[PDB]
Amino acid sequence: NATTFASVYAWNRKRISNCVADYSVIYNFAPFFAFKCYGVSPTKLNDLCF
Amino acid sequence: VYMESEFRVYSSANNCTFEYVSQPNLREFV
Numbered sequence: 001n002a003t004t005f006a007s008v009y010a011w012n013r014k015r016i017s018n019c020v021a022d023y024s025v026i027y028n029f030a031p032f033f034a035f036k037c038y039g040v041s042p043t044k045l046n047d048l049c050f
Numbered sequence: 051v052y053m054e055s056e057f058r059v060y061s062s063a064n065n066c067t068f069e070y071v072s073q074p075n076l077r078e079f080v
């Protein structure tokens with residue numbers, strides 16, 4: 001939901017920890033052009049822990 | 051301190067993988 005994203009050469013990174021990783025809120029945004037996952041499965045991503 | 055305007059305990063910054071905040075004659079600790 002950020003209003004401005006950084007450029008690709010100066011990409012900004014945020015750390016997510018000590019919270020409830022509810023990935024279901026991501027789907028409320030616009031339809032994603034690409035949602036390729038590697039290793040992890042988006043269907044049961046909430047079931048695993050990281 | 052000469053309030054508490056200096057934190058020269060550390061010299062630089064790094065990963066900073068974790069952060070936690072809470073409330074602070076004999077006080078034992080383990």
Ligand SMILES: *[C@@H]1O[C@H](CO)[C@@H](O)[C@H](O)[C@H]1NC(C)=O
Nearest residue numbers: 001002003004027028029030
């Ligand atoms: C968050 O997304 C909504 C649309 O899903 C948008 O209307 C809103 O402006 C966004 N928030 C910010 C702070 O831009």
